[PDB]
């Protein structure tokens, strides 16, 4: 059952990876918007 555990771990890390990448897309948008506000 450690094999199934490993599979779940990978799927979970893939979900986490997407969460983090979506956050980066949001932050890049914030960086641009504040840069435009400041300049």
């Amino acid at each position: 059952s450690v094999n199934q555990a490993s599979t779940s771990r990978l799927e979970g890390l893939q979900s986490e990876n997407h969460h983090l990448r979506m956050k980066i897309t949001e932050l890049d948008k914030d960086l641009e918007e504040v840069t435009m506000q400041l300049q």
Binding site: S6, L10, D28, L38
Partner: protein
């Protein structure tokens, strides 16, 4: 899947560092709005 998980764990950690860096940069820019 063990290698992939080990590598993906490290990637996610690095992405968290990138996120912290970007949030701090946004904060720095907002600090510049005032002064």
């Amino acid at each position: 899947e063990e290698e992939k998980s080990r590598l993906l764990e490290k990637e996610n950690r690095e992405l968290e560092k990138i996120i912290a860096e970007k949030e701090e940069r946004v904060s720095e820019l907002r600090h510049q709005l005032q002064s």
